[PDB]
Amino acid sequence: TKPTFYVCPPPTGSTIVRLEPPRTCPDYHLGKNFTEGIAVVYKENIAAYKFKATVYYKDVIVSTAWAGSSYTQITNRYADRVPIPVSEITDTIDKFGKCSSKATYVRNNHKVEAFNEDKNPQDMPLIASKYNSVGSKAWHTTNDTYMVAGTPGTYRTGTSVNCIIEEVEARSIFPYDSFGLSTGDIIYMSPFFGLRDGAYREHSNYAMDRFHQFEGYRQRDLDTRALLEPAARNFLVTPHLTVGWNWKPKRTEVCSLVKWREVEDVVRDEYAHNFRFTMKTLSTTFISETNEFNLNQIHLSQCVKEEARAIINRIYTTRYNSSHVRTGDIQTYLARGGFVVVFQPLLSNSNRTITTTSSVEFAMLQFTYDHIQEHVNEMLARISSSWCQLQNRERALWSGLFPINPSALASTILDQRVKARILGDVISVSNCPELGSDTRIILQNSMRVSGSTTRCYSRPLISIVSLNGSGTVEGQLGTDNELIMSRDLLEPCVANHKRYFLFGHHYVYYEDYRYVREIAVHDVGMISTYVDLNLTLLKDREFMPLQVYTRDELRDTGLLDYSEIQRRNQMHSLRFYDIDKVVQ
Amino acid sequence: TKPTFYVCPPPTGSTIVRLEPPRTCPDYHLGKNFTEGIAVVYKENIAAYKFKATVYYKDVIVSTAWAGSSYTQITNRYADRVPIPVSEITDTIDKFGKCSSKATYVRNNHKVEAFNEDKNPQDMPLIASKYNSVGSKAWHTTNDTYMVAGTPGTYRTGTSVNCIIEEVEARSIFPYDSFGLSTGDIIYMSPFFGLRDGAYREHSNYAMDRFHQFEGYRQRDLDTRALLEPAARNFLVTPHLTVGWNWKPKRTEVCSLVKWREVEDVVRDEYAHNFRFTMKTLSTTFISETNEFNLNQIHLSQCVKEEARAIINRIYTTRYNSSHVRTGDIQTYLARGGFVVVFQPLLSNSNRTITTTSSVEFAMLQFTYDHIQEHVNEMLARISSSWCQLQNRERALWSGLFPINPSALASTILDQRVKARILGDVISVSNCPELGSDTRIILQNSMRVSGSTTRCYSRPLISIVSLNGSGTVEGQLGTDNELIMSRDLLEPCVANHKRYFLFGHHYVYYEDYRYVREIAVHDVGMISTYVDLNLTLLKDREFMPLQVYTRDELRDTGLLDYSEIQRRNQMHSLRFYDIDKVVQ
Amino acid sequence: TKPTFYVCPPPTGSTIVRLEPPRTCPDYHLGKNFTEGIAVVYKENIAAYKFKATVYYKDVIVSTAWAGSSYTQITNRYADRVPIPVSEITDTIDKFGKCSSKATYVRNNHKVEAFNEDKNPQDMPLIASKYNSVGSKAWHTTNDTYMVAGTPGTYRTGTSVNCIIEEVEARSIFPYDSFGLSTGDIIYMSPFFGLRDGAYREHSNYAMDRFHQFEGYRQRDLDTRALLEPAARNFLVTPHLTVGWNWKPKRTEVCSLVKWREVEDVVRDEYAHNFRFTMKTLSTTFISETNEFNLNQIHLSQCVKEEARAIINRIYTTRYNSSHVRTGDIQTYLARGGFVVVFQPLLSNSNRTITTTSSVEFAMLQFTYDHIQEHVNEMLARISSSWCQLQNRERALWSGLFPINPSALASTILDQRVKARILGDVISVSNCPELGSDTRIILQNSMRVSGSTTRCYSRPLISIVSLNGSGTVEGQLGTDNELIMSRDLLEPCVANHKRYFLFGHHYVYYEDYRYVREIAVHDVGMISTYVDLNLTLLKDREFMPLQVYTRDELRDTGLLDYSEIQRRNQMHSLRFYDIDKVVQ
Ligand SMILES: *[C@@H]1O[C@H](CO)[C@@H](O[C@@H]2O[C@H](CO)[C@@H](O[C@H]3O[C@H](CO[C@H]4O[C@H](CO)[C@@H](O)[C@H](O[C@H]5O[C@H](CO)[C@@H](O)[C@H](O)[C@@H]5O)[C@@H]4O)[C@@H](O)[C@H](O[C@H]4O[C@H](CO)[C@@H](O)[C@H](O)[C@@H]4O)[C@@H]3O)[C@H](O)[C@H]2NC(C)=O)[C@H](O)[C@H]1NC(C)=O
Ligand SMILES: *[C@@H]1O[C@H](CO)[C@@H](O[C@@H]2O[C@H](CO)[C@@H](O[C@H]3O[C@H](CO[C@H]4O[C@H](CO)[C@@H](O)[C@H](O[C@H]5O[C@H](CO)[C@@H](O)[C@H](O)[C@@H]5O)[C@@H]4O)[C@@H](O)[C@H](O[C@H]4O[C@H](CO)[C@@H](O)[C@H](O)[C@@H]4O)[C@@H]3O)[C@H](O)[C@H]2NC(C)=O)[C@H](O)[C@H]1NC(C)=O
Ligand SMILES: *[C@@H]1O[C@H](CO)[C@@H](O[C@@H]2O[C@H](CO)[C@@H](O[C@H]3O[C@H](CO[C@H]4O[C@H](CO)[C@@H](O)[C@H](O[C@H]5O[C@H](CO)[C@@H](O)[C@H](O)[C@@H]5O)[C@@H]4O)[C@@H](O)[C@H](O[C@H]4O[C@H](CO)[C@@H](O)[C@H](O)[C@@H]4O)[C@@H]3O)[C@H](O)[C@H]2NC(C)=O)[C@H](O)[C@H]1NC(C)=O
Ligand SMILES: *[C@@H]1O[C@H](CO)[C@@H](O)[C@H](O)[C@H]1NC(C)=O
Ligand SMILES: *[C@@H]1O[C@H](CO)[C@@H](O)[C@H](O)[C@H]1NC(C)=O
Ligand SMILES: *[C@@H]1O[C@H](CO)[C@@H](O)[C@H](O)[C@H]1NC(C)=O
């Protein structure tokens, strides 16, 4: 509650200062050279190469029964899948639509045969299965299996043979040196093995005697009974069945890269030694290197070039036909995480394999961060430039207002109470030491000069009585609790005089140069020159490691688990038998 | 180092200007109409429907031995799994807990039988396996397998039959038209096939003679020897075993959608034709359309409605019991990426299938971007409003300070040195052309008027001597290196005169109207009116395509790989035999 | 188009106000105590434990042929895999590199034997398969299979036996109580079962008579014919083959945690009860708890401690050898989502199992949000501090300029036209009520005082004629369309008088105290004191649920699908046979 006053001795030319000329503000050259265009992004092809084939085999069952007193007993049953030799196929099924009843094959290196029901061989028609729905079709000749019992006390052996033609779906994966079938049989030969076009250099685990090729082969549709259209056709006689598939060259069917996404409007900027591809429709930003990608380092990449050319030409002709024009041939870049962006640059009218990560967020995060960063940097640059203009403008008010009141402005700028004079075009400042304790300042009642009536004081008079015995100073009350050491502020005595003066924590009121009243500072109504800026801060957040499906849930979508079946079924003999007891 | 001076000819009323009235600032109406409430998010169910069943079968082994000189030789061994007909089950096992020793079945379309050890049929008790741990239990009758040798030189055939009852776990996937068992057998009949409640319209690949239903069937627990509780029970006699499972209706057990996450506090805002669901506890924002979702377009969605009703009612009663109140029935929205949000709106007291993506991460990105965007937009709006108030306030200082010094303020505003006059309520400006070269300005030593002593000049006097022969102008030094063409700035000769004047790069010092000294501008102490704003920019970042597990690592978690086993084991005959040699 | 004037009655001391002292601005203490260091992040090990083993078995085929008239007929063929007893192995193959031609085994609890071709037993050399490429090698003795036909009308039975030694790859998963082989056989014994070191306490589903251990066993390489180096070796005789594998202790080979990523420069800050690990090279932020993690709660975690010690010591010695120094032993924290960060703190020179999520995004998002939040909060703090200094500085201009023009500044601050007086050190304001309608203000032509020539008016004179009959006021035009009710603003008649005054929407021009002309306000040239701030807002974005591979694509990378093979092949008997017809 104690007011602090100062005592400012008269200044001296010692400390002179000046206002700095207006500072220049940096011009922020934020903005890069970009390039609009069209892009097609390609990922690695992880799917298996899928085609359709046919299996031709005969089901040769050999049943041995023991005819008993009142029953028949099967004492053996040997089921076996045997191939159909290509001679019978190309000479009987695709000729008359019939299949011989006699199996001729090779087992244990011997040429063995077998006859259904031990009868004369016939040619039976191939009849569709009862479940021949779409896709999975099969034609067989016999619905019955033959066995005989005999007279009680003897063994009799029967035998069935069932000509079966099934359409299967084959499937081969890189490096395409084998393919498995829906029946479960692995065929250790590439689907592109042949005799011409350098195909004889494919992989094959079989001898060339098992392999037959029919150029111009006209396969037969067993439903419409009509020959199909000519097409080279491979036939391979596996020890347990015969596979046949339409031959197709390797160069035109499989390709390591597949189109992932077409992007109509991209923008390529160049940031510090690296390219950047911003795609605002996907909200995805890929970051490549400045070098081109040579598609000769990747196996089987012949599709992408022409595929992307057709797609990119269509996109340009359908969207940018009139606004822009092309500027050269397509460029190929390897984006980060294993992607391949085929980029066509537009202008306005003015060996290994690639492994792709399984994400797109490392890119969506990149786009979002780039957006916020670019925008916030632009806004900060604008704030900075605007701030400079405002300071350079306020320098004029400060420089133009010093003549009117130099001491107040110099005390504000230096954040310390000082007394300043204008010595022409410069300012001579001087520190005002604060009035210490042991000092009693008494306030006089009247502002009138003694005896004189046309002249009166301007500010209230005070008496700074000293306590250390240094006498008694008699001055008057300056401004902002500044105590001048003289009474040289007089004025012509105005009429209807009313003034308020700041005395510590009070506003003393003087009417006709005499004390009238006093009012606390906290009682006077307030006027604010302050403009408000209530800026709130971003709060801290914590992200939870959320998931839509767990690994268990993702390994729970199939009908059977191979490892489960094997763990449960491979202890059939341990569970239900005693493998440790010996019989003597 | 050369100072540049100007020469300002007297202005003319030609160019008059004025201060613009205060500009209005836009009121930013940033803020949307939101709606708090509770939500439950549902994903597609990708798991298989799992139940428990029992398999009843007999292991019929037929061994053929050749008794030799000093050894016995197995010349054949035919193992086979055969069904247990439902008559024996429902009449002997669930009646006395015993199983007949005689197998009666159908092979090759003939009714065949077989007897263990070729003896009289018995009824053996079903005994638990030695490995009957939790879950996987099995009861069998015989631990031994019977075979006989005979006299050296003859073949003898034995036969075992082992009654086996196993509890398996069945598993069926959409569209639920088959189910596989832990033993490996596919049962081509839906788990919900029956005779009542329209169940006879399910899928079945078998004839109705193989199917038996026992309404009110009381199954028997082979451990506590006690009947279980009544429940309709289906029995199906597959050619190789008999499956039995408790029947359950399709409408009450399987449902395409499963609850993923309950969210207690959500907020639905409406942004440009689309809904948005902000969930601050998950930090996830889903973006749907304005339309409701009809759950009748999705197969098997009967669970979600009532399930969500119970959960949502519990959540309200446990958290928002007193603060808010409900405002109508639940609404169903299809969020983006394939999710289903069942949203219950609160208020304060004042056919196909759905395919779900495997990542809500695009939604965590959405939430984070929405947060930064909303907050930064709010802060920019506040900066803009505050900026307007500050400019509208500084307009008062500029307008109020022009009378004191019009030329300085007009030179600052126009960013060009000009001379302005106040022609009443307007300002008449005039350009000040800069003083060119070939001009020598000489500085006079004394500021005193010749002869006069009570009158002296205010600013130093200069002599602008010309070189093109245009004579010699004699004026004095104005302010800011302005060269007035006259000497009309006089003053009453003050006592103790001290002034500093700016002469190019120097402050010339004059004491009693005579030159005294000079000081370089770079030597005078400085006072700064500048407030600092050191704003730093966001730097560029590069995100690496990081992963926790690769695709290989994710295909390395199982005990066996089916394709690996098949590639290695299906060349057993090629590796270890010579399939190309013929014997003659 | 109508100008609005005011009428301000003379103020009264009633409403006095004052400028607020400068407001203090909060010092933003944004900044946390961080700790630099090195970290190694460890994920859960999901891969199977993979080792190499050898299988020793004999292929015993038993063929029964029926020699016919002009052909041979196989009436049975029983293939079987039989073990090689360990006596023959350790006494003949690893001694001489030969294998006996006689199989001795146990089937149906009887000790059975069999001889290839029914000949005298021999010792045949083990010969490599023709396909012995890298890795998968196999040595067998016979490429041929023996069978005989006989005289037409009789059955003859042959038999092959083929000694086969294959190198397989075994594979066991947690809790390591079984392992499967590449041949498909499950071995129900832990790979770490033994006789010493407490290994006899592992899991084993077999009797101890089937198990043999050879301490110091020197296995034999069948290619270089040389003994290998000594190593304890387990042998187990499974009912269908014999497995042999080098024994290795459980404590030194398998460990639940695997090193995921080494991070050279991390920074651990402490935010609200939780630790945070910022890794700027990965752009990843993990958020743990303040507690240490006890690695004794996790099974098989013995690797991580010493592994991380070696790696962390190497990292320090290679990068931070001279800049920093260590500050204690390593600390172990469980980050969120199931990760384990082993953190070594640096200083400058001044039981269950852990389940890991499959993401590295919930943390890349965390890092990015932390970066934007920290930077934007720092910038907002700087804007706020700068704003305070600027307001505290502008308070000096407002306080210092009130003496010059109190009414204009008080009208601007209060955003309302008022009339203010300076009553010493305070300001007494008074509201100026606006001049209503029914009032005609007439403008006089001359500014000259009647008769007097050395004295003239300063502002144009007006006559406010009243219409309600209240007479006619005669005053003059004040400033800013303020209508003073008196004519007390006179001036010494200057020469060359030129003034512009604002009359509504016009600037009336007066030359020598007489009306001259008028100009519309919209016609006067403009000067702007306004500094521009064009701040643009962030626009709304929508993220699409993008994916690189779908779930189908990820389940399409294998050669065969087990469930597909089983669904297609398990209806072989239903498709191609008639299981519903009975023969009588
Ligand atoms: C061994 O026995 C089986 C039967 O156990 C024999 O199968 C028969 O042969 C038919 C020809 O292959 C086969 O397909 C037939 O039916 C197909 C389905 O069409 C429906 O409408 C039929 C009435 O016209 C109806 O009988 C039939 O119902 C049977 O099939 C359904 C299918 O799920 C079962 O649910 C039933 O239980 C029942 O078994 C169907 O509802 C039909 O598409 C077939 O037509 C073929 O040919 C057409 C040319 O005209 C062509 O246009 C069409 O696309 C098809 O390719 C065909 O009519 C049946 O399964 C069965 N036939 C009968 C009398 O039901 C099998 O042939 C035999 N094998 C040998 C070698 O002997
Ligand atoms: C063919 O031969 C096999 C043996 O080769 C027969 O199996 C026997 O029959 C028992 C009943 O099915 C079967 O289970 C028994 O043991 C179970 C384990 O309990 C433990 O504690 C026992 C102490 O009393 C101990 O002997 C036993 O150790 C045996 O089993 C473990 C299993 O890992 C082996 O590791 C050992 O080598 C040893 O063989 C166990 O440690 C036990 O749970 C069973 O109790 C059942 O019934 C209880 C009712 O009272 C019930 O409460 C409980 O829940 C169980 O359901 C039971 O005691 C054994 O494998 C074996 N018995 C013996 C004497 O070892 C098989 O029956 C036979 N098949 C036929 C048809 O002939
Ligand atoms: C049952 O019959 C099969 C044949 O049907 C017998 O297999 C023979 O035995 C050889 C030894 O195991 C086996 O491997 C031999 O060839 C390997 C490949 O090397 C190549 O270069 C050879 C030039 O000399 C060339 O002949 C050979 O071409 C054959 O094999 C390739 C393999 O794909 C086929 O594509 C061809 O069609 C052709 O069949 C190869 O191109 C070779 O690595 C082997 O050397 C081993 O031993 C070396 C020690 O000196 C060692 O350095 C090396 O690392 C190998 O371990 C070996 O020469 C062949 O498959 C075959 N031999 C012949 C004559 O082709 C099998 O032995 C028999 N089983 C029994 C028990 O009777
Ligand atoms: C700023 O705004 C927030 C939001 O309502 C408010 O809580 C806070 O009190 C405000 N601060 C000031 C100083 O007005
Ligand atoms: C702004 O702050 C940064 C951070 O320390 C500093 O490097 C830079 O020099 C500062 N700029 C100015 C102009 O002070
Ligand atoms: C602000 O800048 C944007 C960007 O070009 C522009 O469209 C807009 O008109 C500007 N606003 C103002 C008021 O100048």
Which of A342, A355, A286 has its CA nearest to residue A45? A355
Cα dihedral: C66, C67, C69, C74 (round 10) = 50
SS (H, E, C) B71-85: CEEEEEEEEEEEECC
Subunit contact A140:C535, Cβ cutoff 8 A: no
**Contact call for residues C580 and B209 (beta carbons, < 8 A):** yes
Name which of C180, C399, C578 is nearest A566 (Cβ-Cβ): C180
Contact list in A for residue C366 (CB cut-off 8 A) is: 542-543
Q: Which residues of B touch A361 (CB under 8 A)?
A: 359, 361-362, 365
Distance from C-alpha of B396 to C-alpha of A371, rounded to nearest angstrom: 40
What residues does C82 pair with on adjacent strands? C58
Cα–Cα distance between A284 and C545 in angstroms, integer? 12
Could you identify the atom of ligand 4 that is nearest to the CA of residue A534? Answer: 1
Lookup: tokens for B225: 């020897």
Q: Where are the domains of chain A?
A: 1-13+433-525, 14-33+357-432, 34-47+253-356, 48-252, 526-584
Establish if C449 touches chain B: CB-CB under 8 angstroms.
no
End-to-end CA distance of chain C: 117
Where chain B is discontinuous (C–N > 2.5 Å), the residues before each break are: 350
Q: Which chains touch A (3 or more CB pairs under 8 A)?
A: B, C
User: What does the H/E/C string look like for B419-456?
Assistant: EEEECECCEEEEECCECCCCEEEEECCECECCCCCCEE
Task: Measure the CA–CA gap between B92 and A383, rounded to whole angstroms.
Answer: 92
CA–CA dist B546, A395 (Å, integer): 53
| CA–CA distance, C551 with B43 (Å, rounded to integer) | 15
CA angle at B561 for the pair B560 and B562, rounded to the nearest 5°: 110
User: What's C92's DSSP letter?
Assistant: I
Contacts (Cβ under 8 Å, ≥6 apart) of C89: C56, C235, C242, C244
What span, in angstroms and rounded, lies between the C-alpha atoms of B178 and A559? 9
For residue C350, the CA-to-ligand 5 centroid distance in Å is: 23
Q: Which two tokens stand for residue C246?
A: 């080098």
Residue with tokens 């090689």: C84
Percentages of chain B per state (helix, strand, coil), in multiples of 5: 20, 35, 45
Q: Which two tokens stand for residue C313?
A: 């010591």
Distance CA C271, CA C370 (A): 12
Rounded CA-CA distance A464/A476 in Å is: 9
Cβ distance of B527 and A17 shorter than 8 Å: yes
Atom of ligand 1 nearest to the CA of A139: 71
Buried/exposed A430-439: b ≥16 CB within 10 Å, e otherwise = bebeebeeeb
Q: Is C534 in the pocket of ligand 6 (CB under 6 A)?
A: yes
Residue C485 has a CB neighbour count (10 Å cut-off) of 15
At A458, list the tokens: 């301007």
Best of A81, A372, A555, A575 to disrupt the B interface (most B CBs within 10 Å) is A575
Q: In angstroms, what CA-CA distances link A583 with A36, B135, B145, C106, C111?
A: 86, 33, 11, 10, 8
Q: Report the neighbours of C using a cutoff of 3 or more CB pairs below 8 angstroms.
A: A, B
Q: Is the dihedral of CA C514, C519, C525, C529 positive or negative?
A: positive
∠ Cα C94 C98 C104 (to 5°) = 95
Q: What is the DSSP string of C531-544?
A: PP--PPPPPP----
CA-to-CA dists, residue C448 to A560, C487, C511, angstroms: 113, 12, 11
State the best of B107, B269, B560, B580 to mutate against chain C, taking most chain C CBs within 10 Å. B560
**CB within 8 Å of chain B, chain C residues 10-49:** 43, 46-48
Round to whole Å and give the CA distance between C512 and C491: 13
Task: With H, G, I as helix, E, B as strand and everything else as coil, classify residue A108.
Answer: coil
Find the helix packing angle between C406-413 and B361-401, rounded to 10°. Answer: 160
User: In this structure, how many other beta carbons lie within 10 angstroms of the beta carbon of residue A554?
Assistant: 17
Q: How many CB atoms lie within 10 A of CB B31?
A: 9
CA within 13 Å, CB half, C493: 13
Cβ–Cβ below 8 Å for C569 and A183: yes
Q: Cβ(A140)–Cβ(C576) under 8 Å?
A: yes
Separation CA C420–CA C424 (nearest Å): 12
> Is A349 within 8 Å of chain B by CB?
no
C422 vs B394, C91, C410, CA distance in Å?
A: 21, 123, 11
Helix, strand, coil tally for chain C in percent (to 5): 20, 40, 45
Ligand 3 lining (C-beta closer than 6 Å):
B 578; C 127-128, 130, 132, 140-141, 143, 223
Q: Is the Cβ of A361 closer than 8 Å to some Cβ of chain C?
A: yes
What is the DSSP secondary structure assignment for residue A220, as one 8-state letter?
A: B
Q: What is the DSSP string of B36-99?
A: EEEEEEEEE--SPEEEEEEEEEEEEEEEEEEE-SS-EEEEEEEEEEEE--HHHIIIIIHHHSEE
Of A124, A129, A121, nearest in space to A96 by CA: A124
User: What is the C-alpha to C-alpha distance for residues A334 and A42, in angstroms, rounded to an integer?
Assistant: 10
Give the distance (Å) from ligand 1 centre to CA of residue B202. Answer: 19
Q: Which B-chain residues 308-337 have CB contacts (< 8 A) with chain C?
A: 336-337
Q: Token pair 């495997």 is at which residue?
A: B358
- Asked whether the beta carbons of residue B356 and residue A397 sit closer than 8 angstroms, the reply is no
Which residues, numbered 248 to 267 in chain A, qualify as contacts with chain C under a Cβ-Cβ cut-off of 8 Å? 260
Tell me if C111 sits within 8 A of C104, measured CB to CB.
Answer: yes
Render B331-356 in DSSP notation, one character per residue: EEEEETTTEEEEEEEEEE---B----
* Residue A315 three-state SS: helix
∠B440-B446-B447 over CA atoms, to 5°? 100
| The pair of three-digit structure tokens given for residue C11, joined into one six-digit string | 């103020």
Interface contact A398-C398, CB threshold 8 A: no
Report the residue from C76, C538, C569 with minimal CB separation from A62: C76
Output the DSSP codes for A247-277.
---HHHH--SEEEEEEEEEEEEEEETTEEEE
The SS3 assignment for B368 reads helix
Tokens of B34: 């939101």
Beta strands in C495-565 (DSSP E): 498-503, 506-511, 515-520
Q: How far apart are CA A30 and CA C479, in angstroms?
A: 47
Alpha carbon C491 to chain centroid distance?
A: 80
Q: Which two tokens stand for residue B568?
A: 């290695």
CA–CA gap between residue C83 and residue C81 (Å, rounded): 7
Burial class (CB in 10 A: 0-12, 13-18, 19+), B302: middle
Q: How far apart are CA B182 and CA A102, in angstroms?
A: 39
Nearest CA to C159 among C218, C95, C78, C275? C78
Long-range contacts of B85-90 (CB under 8 A, 24+ apart): B85/B237, B85/B242, B86/B212, B86/B235, B86/B237, B86/B242, B89/B56, B89/B235, B89/B242, B89/B244, B90/B214, B90/B217
Tokens of C458: 């300063």
The sign of the dihedral angle between the CA atoms of A519, A521, A523, A529 is: positive
- The Cα–Cα gap between A241 and A170 comes to 14
Chain B hits for A578, CB-CB cut-off 8 Å, are: 143-144
Q: If you measure from the C-alpha of residue B204 to the centroid of ligand 1, how many angstroms do you get, rounded to a whole number?
A: 16
User: What does the alpha-carbon distance between residue C459 and residue C477 come to, in Å, rounded to a whole number?
Assistant: 6
Q: Which two tokens stand for residue B130?
A: 């030695």
Residue ranges around ligand 5 (CB below 6 Å): B 534, 536
Tokens of A277: 């591809």
Nearest to A423 among B364, B499, B529 (CB): B499
Tokens standing for residue A184: 């479960």
State whether residue A541 sits within 8 Å of chain C by CB. yes
| Residue in the block written with tokens 């199992």 | C353
State how far the alpha carbon of A436 is from the alpha carbons of A5, A429, B558, in Å. 8, 22, 88
Per the CB < 8 A criterion, the answer to whether C6 and C481 are in contact is yes
Alpha-carbon distance of B130 to B139, in angstroms, equals 9
Q: Are C429 and C419 in contact (CB under 8 A)?
A: yes
Cβ contacts of B294 within 8 Å, gap of 6 or more: B332
Rounded Cα–Cα distance for residues A331 and A38 (Å): 11
Assess B564–C contact: CB distance below 8 Å, yes or no: yes
Q: How close is the Cα of A534 to the center of ligand 4, in Å? A: 6
Q: Which of B550, B477, B511 is nearest to B6 (CA)?
A: B477
Q: Say whether C283 and B541 touch across the interface (CB within 8 A).
A: yes
* C537 interfacial to chain A (CB closer than 8 Å): no
The whole-angstrom separation of Cα A292 and Cα A298 is 14
Distance of CA A244 to the CA centre of its chain: 45
Q: Which residues contact C350 (CB under 8 A, 6 or more apart)?
A: none
Q: Which atom of ligand 5 is nearest to the CA of B534?
A: 1
Instruction: Tell me the pairing of strands B257-271 and B284-289.
Output: unpaired
Residues with CB under 6 A from ligand 2: A 578; B 127-128, 130, 132, 140-141, 143, 223
> How far apart are the CA of A59 and the centre of ligand 1, in A?
22
User: Residue C41 is which amino acid?
Assistant: V
Closest Cα in chain A to B481: A425
Task: Give the residues across from B168 on adjacent strands.
Answer: B53
Chains touching chain B through at least 3 C-beta pairs below 8 angstroms are A, C
Flag if C129 and B576 touch (Cβ within 8 Å): yes
For residue C63, list chain A residues with Cβ-Cβ distance below 8 A. 107-108
Q: Which amino acid is at B117?
A: E
Integer Cα distance of B267 and B285 in angstroms: 10
Ligand 2: distance of its center to the CA of B130 in Å? 5
CA distance between the termini of chain B:
117
Shortest Cα–Cα distance, A469 to chain C (Å)? 33
What residues contact C306, with CB distance under 8 A and at least 6 apart? Answer: none
Please list, in sequence order, all residues whose beta carbon lies within 8 angstroms of the beta carbon of residue C191, skipping any fewer than 6 positions away. Answer: C49, C51, C170, C172, C176, C179, C245, C248
**DSSP per-residue letters across C217-282:** ---B-TTT--B-----EEEEEETTEEEEEE---HHHH--SEEEEEEEEEEEEEEETTEEEEEETTT
CB A541 within 8 A of CB C369: yes
**b/e sequence C42-63, b meaning 16+ C-beta within 10 Å:** bbbbbebbeeebbbbbbbbbbb
CA distance B177 to B193: 9
Q: Which of C111, C113, C499 is facing B423, going by the closest CB pair?
A: C499
Length of chain C: 584
Token digits of residue B378: 């709010």
Instruction: Check CB contact of B1 with chain C, cutoff 8 Å.
Output: no
On whether the CB atoms of residues A220 and A97 are closer than 8 A, the answer is: yes
* Minimal-distance CA residue to ligand 2 atom 48: B223
Of all protein residues, whose CA lies closest to atom 49 belonging to ligand 3?
C223
- Could you say which DSSP state residue A323 is in? T
